[PDB]
Amino acid sequence: MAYDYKQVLRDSLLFYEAQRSGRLPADQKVTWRKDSALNDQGDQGQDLTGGYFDAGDFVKFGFPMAYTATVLAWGLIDFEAGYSSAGALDDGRKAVKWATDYFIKAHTSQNEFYGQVGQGDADHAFWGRPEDMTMARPAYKIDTSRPGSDLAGETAAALAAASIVFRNVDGTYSNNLLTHARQLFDFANNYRGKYSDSITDARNFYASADYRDELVWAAAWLYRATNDNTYLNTAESLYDEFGLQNWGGGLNWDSKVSGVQVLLAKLTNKQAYKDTVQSYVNYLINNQQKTPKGLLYIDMWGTLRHAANAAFIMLEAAELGLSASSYRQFAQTQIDYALGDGGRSFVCGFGSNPPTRPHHRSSSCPPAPATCDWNTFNSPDPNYHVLSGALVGGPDQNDNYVDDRSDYVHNEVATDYNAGFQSALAALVALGY
Numbered sequence: 001m002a003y004d005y006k007q008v009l010r011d012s013l014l015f016y017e018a019q020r021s022g023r024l025p026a027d028q029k030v031t032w033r034k035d036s037a038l039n040d041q042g043d044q045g046q047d048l049t050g051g052y053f054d055a056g057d058f059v060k061f062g063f064p065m066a067y068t069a070t071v072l073a074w075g076l077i078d079f080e081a082g083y084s085s086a087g088a089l090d091d092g093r094k095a096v097k098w099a100t101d102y103f104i105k106a107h108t109s110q111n112e113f114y115g116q117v118g119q120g121d122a123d124h125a126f127w128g129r130p131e132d133m134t135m136a137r138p139a140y141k142i143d144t145s146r147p148g149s150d151l152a153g154e155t156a157a158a159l160a161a162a163s164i165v166f167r168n169v170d171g172t173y174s175n176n177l178l179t180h181a182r183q184l185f186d187f188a189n190n191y192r193g194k195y196s197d198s199i200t201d202a203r204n205f206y207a208s209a210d211y212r213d214e215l216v217w218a219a220a221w222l223y224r225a226t227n228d229n230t231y232l233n234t235a236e237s238l239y240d241e242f243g244l245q246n247w248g249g250g251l252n253w254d255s256k257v258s259g260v261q262v263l264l265a266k267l268t269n270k271q272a273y274k275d276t277v278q279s280y281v282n283y284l285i286n287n288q289q290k291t292p293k294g295l296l297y298i299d300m301w302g303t304l305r306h307a308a309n310a311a312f313i314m315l316e317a318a319e320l321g322l323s324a325s326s327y328r329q330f331a332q333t334q335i336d337y338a339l340g341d342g343g344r345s346f347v348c349g350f351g352s353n354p355p356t357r358p359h360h361r362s363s364s365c366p367p368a369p370a371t372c373d374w375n376t377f378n379s380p381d382p383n384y385h386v387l388s389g390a391l392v393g394g395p396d397q398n399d400n401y402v403d404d405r406s407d408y409v410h411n412e413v414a415t416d417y418n419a420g421f422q423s424a425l426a427a428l429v430a431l432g433y
Contacts, residue, residue, distance in 0.1 A: 001336070001341070003336060003339045003340070003351075005086075005335075005425050005428045005429045005433060006085060006086035006087075006088075006429050007086075007350075008339065008347065008350060008389070008425050009082065009083070009086045009088055009422065009425040009426055009429060010086060010087075010088055010091075010389075011347065011349060011350055011388045011389035012389040012391075012418050012421065012422040012425060013088060013091045013092065013095055013389065013422070014029060014030055014349075014388040014389045015348075015387065015388060015389030015390045015391075015413075015418055016052070016072075016095045016098070016389075016415070016418065016422075017029055017030040017033070017095075018030045018033055018362065018363065018387060018388075018389075018390075019052045019053050019054075019415055020033065020050075020052060020053075020098060021036060021037045021040070021049070021050060021051050021052060021053050021058070021060060021130070022035070022036070022037060022038065022040070022049040022050035022051065022102075023035050023038060023049065023050075030388075032362075032363075032367065032385045033362060034129070034130075034131045035131060036058075036129070036130035036131040036133065037049065037053075037058065037060075037117070037118075037130060037133065037137065039137070040060070040117045040118075040137055040139070041139060042108055042114055042139050042141070043139065043141070044108075046105065046108050046114075047105055048060075048102070048105055048106060048114055048117050048139055049105075050098065050101055050102040050105065051065060051098070051099060051101075051102030051103075051106075051117075052065055052068070052098065052099060052102075052415050053130065053362075053415075054414060054415055055359075055360070055412060055413060055414035055415065055417075056358065056359045056360035056361055056408075056412065056413060056414075057118075057123050057124055057361065058118055058123050058126075058130045058133060058361070059116065059117070059118035059119070059120060059123045059124075059205075060102075060116060060117040060118060061115075061116060061202065061205060061206050062106065062113075062114070062115035062116055062151055062155065062195075063115065063150065063151050063154060063195065063202065063206045063208075063253060063254075064206055064253040064414070064415060064416040065099060065102075065415060066099075066103065066151065066154040066155040066157070066158045067154050067158075067253040067256075067416055067419065068099065068253075068415045068416050068418075068419045069096055069099035069100060069103070069158035069161070069162065070154060070157045070158040070161050070217075070221070071251075071259075071312070071419035071420055071423055072092070072095055072096050072099075072419055072422060072423065073096045073158065073161035073162045073164070073165050074161055074423060075312070075422065075423025075424075075426045075427065076092050076093065076096060076165050076423075076426070077161065077164050077165060078316065078319065078427070079315075079423065079426040079427045079429070079430040080426075080430075081429075081430040082425070082426030082427060082428070082429035082430035082431075083426055083429075085429050085430070086426075086429055092426075093165060093166070093169065096162050096165055097162070097166075097173075099158065099162075100158065100159060100162045100177055103155050103158065103159060103180070104159075104176070104177075104180055106141075106155075107155075107180050107183070107184060108141070109143075110183045110186075110187065111143060111144050111183075111186075111187045111190075111191065112141055112142075112143045112144075113141060113142050113143075113148070113151065113152055113155065113184065113187070114139050114140065114141040115140060115141060115142055115148060115151045115195055115198075115199045115202070116139065116140040116199050116201065116202060117137055117138075117139045117140075118137045118138070119136075119137070119138050119201055120201055120202075120204065120205050122135045122136065122137075123135070123137070127361055127364075127372075127373060127374045127376065127377045128361065128365060128371075128372040128373055128376070129361070129362060129365045129368065129372050130361070130362055131368075132368075132372065140198075140199040140201060140202075141199070142193075142195050142198045142199060143198075144187075144191050146193070146197075146198035146199075147187075147188075147191040147192060147193030147195070147198060148188075148193060148194065148195025148196075148198050148199065148208075148211075149188040149189070149191070149192050149193055149194070149195070149211040149212075149214060149215060150188075150194060150195050150208050150209075150211035150214040150254075151188075151195035151199075152184045152185070152187045152188035152195070152218075153184075153185065153188040153189075153211065153214030153215050153217060153218040154214050154217070154218070155184050156180075156181045156182075156184035156185040156188060156218040156221070156222065157181075157214075157217050157218045157220075157221040157222075159177045159178070159180050159181035159184065160177070160178065160181040160185075160218070160221040160222045160224070160225040160226075161221050161224075161225070162174075162177050163175075163177040163178040163181060163225045164224065164225050178225060178226065181218075181221075181222060181225065182222065182226075184218075185218045185219065185222055185231075188214065188215060188218060189215055189219075189234075192211070193211070194208030194211055195208055195211070196208040206253065206254070207254075208254070209254040209255050210247075210255070212238070212242045212244075213242070213244060213247065213255060213256060213257055213260060215238050216235050216238045216239045216242065216244060216260050216264075217256055217259065217260050217263070219231045219232075219234045219235035219238065220232075220235040220260060220263050220264055220267060221263070223235060223267060224263075224267055232267065232268070235264065236264070236268070239260070239264065244257055244260060244261070245261075245272070245276055249261075249276070249279075249280035249283070250280075250298075250306075250309070250310070250313075251309040251310070251312065251313050251420060252306070252309060252416075253416045258277065258280055258313045259313070261273045261276045261277050261280075262277050262313060262316045262317055262320065265277055265320055266316075266319070266320060274320055274322060277313075277317050277320065277322065278317070278322050278323070280313070281313065281314050281317050281322070281323075281327060284296060284310050284314075284330075285326075285327075285330050289397070291342075291395065291396075291397055291398060291399045292398060292399060293337065293341075293342045293343070293399045294333060294337060294341075294342070295307055295334065295337045295342060295394075295395070295399070296310055296334060297397045298310070300396070300397075300409060301393070301409065301412075302393055302394075302412065302414070302416075302417050303393055303394040303395070303396075304337075304338050304346055304391050304392065304393065304394035304417070304421075305391065305393075305414075305416065305417040305418075305420065305421070307334040307337065307338070307394075308334060308335060308338060308391065308417075308420045308421035308424055309419075309420035309421075310331075310334065311330075311331035311332075311334040311335055311420070311421075311424045312331070312420040312421075312423050312424040312427070314327040314328070314330055314331040315327070315328060315331045315424055315427040315428075318331075328431060328433075331424060331427075331428075332428060332433060335421070335424050335425065335428060338391060338394070338421070339351055340352050342395065342399055343399070344401075346391065346392050346394050346395070346401075347389065347390065347391055347392075348386060348387040348388060348389065348390040348392065348413070349386040349387060349388030349389060349390075350388070350389070355392045355403045355411055356382035356383060356386070356403055357382055357383055357403050357404060357405040357411060358383060358387050358390055358392055358405070358411050358412075358413045359405055359406070359407070359408045359411045359412050359413065360383065360387055360390070360413050361377075362385070363383045363384070363385040363386070363387040364376050364377060364379070364383045364384060364385075364405070365384055365385070366384045367384075377405065377406075379405075383405070387413065389418070390413040390417075390418065391413065391417050391418050391421050392410065392411050392412065392413055392417075393408070393409050393410045393411060393412045393413075393417075394410060395410070396410070
């Protein structure tokens with residue numbers, strides 16, 4: 001016990017630095033990572049460099065990247081004190097800006113948005129350092145003829161949330177973020193469709209579920225960032241039209257009904273939203289399947305990510321005044337399980353017997369000029385570089401786990417895995433835990 005949440009927060013930020021694509025800054029802290037994907041570009045040659053590599057691969061998947069940005073910004077807004085107490089406010093802002101600077105580039109025209117750079121197969125067929133890639137990296141976009149309400153909506157939400165983050169420190173950037181956010185929401189709302197039906201390569205990696213929750217999510221964030229009642233009216237009208245109160249609860253890259261609900265509860269103070277949030281949280285605490293050691297077991301994919309996402313929803317619910325003490329305590333047990341209460345740490349580079357072989361290319365590689373290829377992937381040795389801060393998939397339903405690089409279910413790491421987790425850490429620090 002007695003975990004240093006401030007340091008885990010800093011570690012999580014190091015994980016995001018390790019996921020950076022493009023030209024790295026002079027003050028980069030994860031120095032084993034080098035400049036890469038410097039030729040990423042749109043169909044007309046527009047600069048698309050930057051952004052985050054999705055997981056252990058080098059594809060830039062826009063949907064989970066936008067989701068990641070929104071959740072990180074969300075925590076920065078509600079639990080800014082946590083970042084400040086950890087002396088990580090500047091880095092926290094940088095983590096959000098690394099994503100939004102890219103979204104701005106990807107927004108090539110008012111109703112055009114690039115949602116992917118790199119093809120799943122060509123990218124995944126390669127195992128090595130990103131700076132060593134030599135395969136073509138196609139860029140895919142959504143537009144008026146091939147829409148993507150979910151992708152455009154989540155990106156609009158991320159931009160709107162980011163505009164709040166930078167409202168005082170960088171007003172000019174804040175204004176720019178908001179302009180793009182408004183345009184992307186209009187695009188998402190005026191041209192309805194699932195982005196993975198347009199960017200078909202994404203259908204087998206980050207498939208669209210039901211884009212409707214994204215429209216409400218984006219509208220709610222825009223209202224928060226502008227105080228423009230039109231967005232609130234749209235958010236609530238669509239919420240009722242789509243009947244979100246009946247949707248399965250939760251917070252994830254593809255479905256965030258609980259996020260929408262706890263957000264609207266705060267923005268409107270309406271009891272109805274609070275009822276839905278309490279019902280969901282109470283269900284998780286009292287009935288959702290758990291491992292014998294106490295970890296919420298929501299699904300086999302990104303198991304810890306699901307528990308940490310739930311923990312963040314609980315922390316947000318506590319802020320509404322809903323069973324604050326019990327909700328915060330339960331959220332802490334989930335984060336604490338990830339940190340080691342179950343017997344070992346599931347955060348790379350942290351705690352007792354952490355995973356040392358995450359399914360991650362860049363960290364597995366030795367420094368150049370030594371070759372990094374599939375033989376490196378096949379190495380019995382731990383990943384050459386410690387991937388500080390990365391939350392892995394985790395143990396199975398019975399708390400069983402084996403550190404294996406080829407086991408993507410349990411050793412997968414991803415930008416969306418650390419989002420809820422990092423924001424929850426900021427909340428725990430803000431609460432003085």
